[PDB]
Symmetry: D2
Subunit: 332 residues, 4 copies
Amino acid sequence: ATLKDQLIYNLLKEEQTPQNKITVVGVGAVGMACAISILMKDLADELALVDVIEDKLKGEMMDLQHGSLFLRTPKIVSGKDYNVTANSKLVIITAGARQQEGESRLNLVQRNVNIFKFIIPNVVKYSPNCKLLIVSNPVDILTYVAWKISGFPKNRVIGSGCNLDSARFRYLMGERLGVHPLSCHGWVLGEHGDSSVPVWSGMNVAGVSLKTLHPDLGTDKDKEQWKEVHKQVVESAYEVIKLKGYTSWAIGLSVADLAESIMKNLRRVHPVSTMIKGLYGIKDDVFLSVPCILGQNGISDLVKVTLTSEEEARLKKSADTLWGIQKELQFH
Amino acid sequence: ATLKDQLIYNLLKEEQTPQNKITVVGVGAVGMACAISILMKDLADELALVDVIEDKLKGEMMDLQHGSLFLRTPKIVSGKDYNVTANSKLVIITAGARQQEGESRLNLVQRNVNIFKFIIPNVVKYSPNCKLLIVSNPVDILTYVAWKISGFPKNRVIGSGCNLDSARFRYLMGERLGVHPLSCHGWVLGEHGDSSVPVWSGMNVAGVSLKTLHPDLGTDKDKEQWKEVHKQVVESAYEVIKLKGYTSWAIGLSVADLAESIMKNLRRVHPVSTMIKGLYGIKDDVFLSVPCILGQNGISDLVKVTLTSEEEARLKKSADTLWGIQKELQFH
Amino acid sequence: ATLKDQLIYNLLKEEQTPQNKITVVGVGAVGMACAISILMKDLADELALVDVIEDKLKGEMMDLQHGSLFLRTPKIVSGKDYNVTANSKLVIITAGARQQEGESRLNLVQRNVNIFKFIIPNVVKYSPNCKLLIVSNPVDILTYVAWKISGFPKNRVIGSGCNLDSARFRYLMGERLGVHPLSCHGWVLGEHGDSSVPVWSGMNVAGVSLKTLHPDLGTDKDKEQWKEVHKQVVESAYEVIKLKGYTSWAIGLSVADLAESIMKNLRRVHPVSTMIKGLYGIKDDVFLSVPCILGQNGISDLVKVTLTSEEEARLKKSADTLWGIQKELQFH
Amino acid sequence: ATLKDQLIYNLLKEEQTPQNKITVVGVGAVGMACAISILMKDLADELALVDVIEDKLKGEMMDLQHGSLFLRTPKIVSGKDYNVTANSKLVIITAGARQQEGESRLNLVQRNVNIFKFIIPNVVKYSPNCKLLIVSNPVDILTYVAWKISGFPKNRVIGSGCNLDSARFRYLMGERLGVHPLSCHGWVLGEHGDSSVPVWSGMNVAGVSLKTLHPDLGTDKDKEQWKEVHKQVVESAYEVIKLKGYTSWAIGLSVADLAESIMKNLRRVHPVSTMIKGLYGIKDDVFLSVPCILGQNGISDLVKVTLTSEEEARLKKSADTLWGIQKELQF
């Protein structure tokens, strides 16, 4: 009669099935920041981690597990085999290839295509009703890639896109004004990167339009140079990488917030990357960021922002660029 | 007028003085893990980071700042200058020397003393009412050093000690029993390291003594080899360092839990490192792990755990070893 | 086109499928304290309230709904019809009669049986795979009642039992000792009420047995009169009723703690009422409180607490008391 | 030696001053909702309850204490004497009179003044550097009263004002749009009650103006009648009362939300009642709801909303009406 059995009378067995499982693919600094942030917000009853480097994956799992006493997520698992990700509600993809010195953007994407041809089908096999959240750079293109390979409908394939960008924009907006970012409002949309669009018309505090107060807001002739705030948004990851050698915390928190709306079915609006053939004159299968309603079925609806002609043309240019790359990919 | 002044009307300007400020020293993986956990538990209204590497320091500051929208800690600052740490309630020390090849234990502690002769007087100058929480290894020795240099009474000088060891033990106790660590009770006391004491007699679930149920517990003749659970605890950091290159997550959560009790004055019992000359026939100024009651003035009380004479001799031997090194240290 | 259609582009149909729904039956002070506590711990994506009094019911629902901005629970429903409770993971029953002047105890219980015969079948029709958590007095009898009427296996029918008793006990233990209740351990087992059993042997702080330190603990000869603490626990609800007219806050927090373990599958050990035919020589279908591992399938395991002969005889006496009442209850 | 002697070894104790203490005055349903939400949001290291009814007060304290296991607020105290409130950072006032059948507005407010003449000096005696948060109806006037009696600067005297009204508005807005209220934005301002003002201009989701998209928004000629959402806001509390007898849960969460911003110095923007002699043609000492930045020194700043002529005038009319009552009061 073992100690366990002298102590505990069993009366039930298992079923396997967990109810609120999240999987994070890739356990680099981004993936692990996604993981700790999700764990501390009690978003899941099971957390699976997956990556190709066995020792690192096991050490990260172990390290999280050793903190279980301080957490409310009772099952943390890992492995190279995707069997461990089974029945996940949300699967967050952070794994990707690192760009080499003399390598084209297109080649870097092709190498990510090849990687995703392993990852994505293994994900769908083991969790056919899950939402995909793609964080991997370049996120807009890799969301398309995940979409084509998975064969999921568009509402269940989401890219992190311009979500953190918008948060950064609001942080900075808050620093200028002396107000918490929760109470500053502003949207960065379109291509996550240099060609993202800061929507000046929507920027406000307490419903007071900044543009109405300051018509030259976000133009060259702006005495206060608010276009710099957006430049800072675009060059913020690069500036952090220079300083500490990578980014993690903001993106981790950012992703955990997206997971929160999905898992809890909150129907909050977030700027995330979605397939938007139809809108703003775009006619190719391309993912850009737009304010989306996020819930248990992924992106259920999206908000139609009125954009000026200039802004509209920025989204159109970004889509041509994205399609320019996507059309040279090889899936078969 | 500016856009800020047209928007916001200022009512008053008073010198901004923070009320629940916490500083973390060292922005290595350990330090940043402590920081992120504290931020996500909302334990402070101001978080300050300090370290000697400026690029890295600033990078970590900015990465956190950038996620402010997702947090409720309004102000994050950093600097190599300790003026940024002014009026901190709790100051957590994670910084220290990394042992060189062929270097003695003593000489490693000495280099940590030279470092603390810089750090500690700067911490006390700028917030003299704070509590010190030492995390850097060797933690029991470095709590002494922190205590001797600060001039602080012992209650305000705390070492993370066996806090995480105990949590690891509970995790592992949990995986054997099939029960969450919250409901598995057991204490690892003494010196944080190879010489720690797993207090078999106190191990329980729902108040039922595992020792009483299974008298061979933690003895060589135990057919379930519960002694290995302790071995796993002692070798956990090593095994994790080997797998993934460092440790961060569990320790960070460990330290935020202590911080919670302190900042909220909860008076929970935590196994942390404290001055115990007087107990277990110990006659020197040595810090070891005993259950302590933590609150807003640090350690207010400690629990007198009853030890077998064998367990008692292990604390004693550890005490002698710690004093052996401590008495060979130079402060002036 | 409406303003909704001009603002929002709908991508798909749904939902009507809630993943973590909790129903609360009864909107007295108890049911609503349970409701608010659950809302502030973010345990559910949907909350349903049911009661027989429509105005009270609509009012409570509204009042909660008006707070939605400060919550993370997006759907709050109520109604007299149990169709609003479809697909609930957990159903918490707080409805029940109060004793009238000159009414016998048997008659009171029978009336509670009579309302359960309306409530339980309606709960099981609409959520046949839910866990049931009975809070209504007398809780041990009515947990039997819900069990027999529902048809559910014993694992999915749970009484709140001595859960709050145990929490009150630890509160007072904490006041006496100068320690937070989180670090004081003690279990009150058996029949919720006058005949409940404070397990002296299991009481400890930091794994140190109080019984071993103080062997007269909880005897008649005890110079410190610890038995009075148990008296206070048993009479605490009565004292609060005298002072303010009813009880709510403590029970509400206590019920939300159990919900947490169920919803999040934590496998924490709680002292809750369960069917213990087979244990302690009891051969009757009776429910009383013993420590139980709680999770997504209700009670999966229980801790065999080692009781002295006296302690065991008391549980056997309660079982006999309980069964003698139950056998006189009409279910047809 | 006692049990305690053998278990616990005690160290020199230093002075415990509470660092995050919040007092709630009035243990009606409103006060108690305020308390429980504050407790479940870990905003305080000490919670004080005060009221004139000793039994009810003690029982409410006890009931919260019995839940200490599931909380992280280690000291909960109560008493009739305001010494139990010493060193509060925030003091939340919920007590106040109930208007009687046939009683004028002036007479009701006068009775509140006499009650506040007992409560306010006592509260400032024991916590002189606190922020006062006034929840008691009529809130705008009673915030004035609390201000003049306390001797406090305007930044430390706060009225819950239109905070909950706006929160209600967003919920109802969310129900129509199928969006969570966190992502619906709109402000209700001015006098808390029938005369409050829904700023249609500021209503947006994701920065897109509803007004711009639907120009007849708010007006009589609106096919969707968005004016009924504000009528619904104005009449909600009244309606909840008919149904259940009283209001508590929503207001409790509303007050905890402001406590959050105050206790943690968040500098979030909340529609609360503040003294706005200076804006909107208002030349009198009156408190109305305006979007205010809340932090550790209370109201540090406010947002200057651009109102329509109609919106401004309604604020101006409320100001006049409030001063007309306040000018007849005797302190």
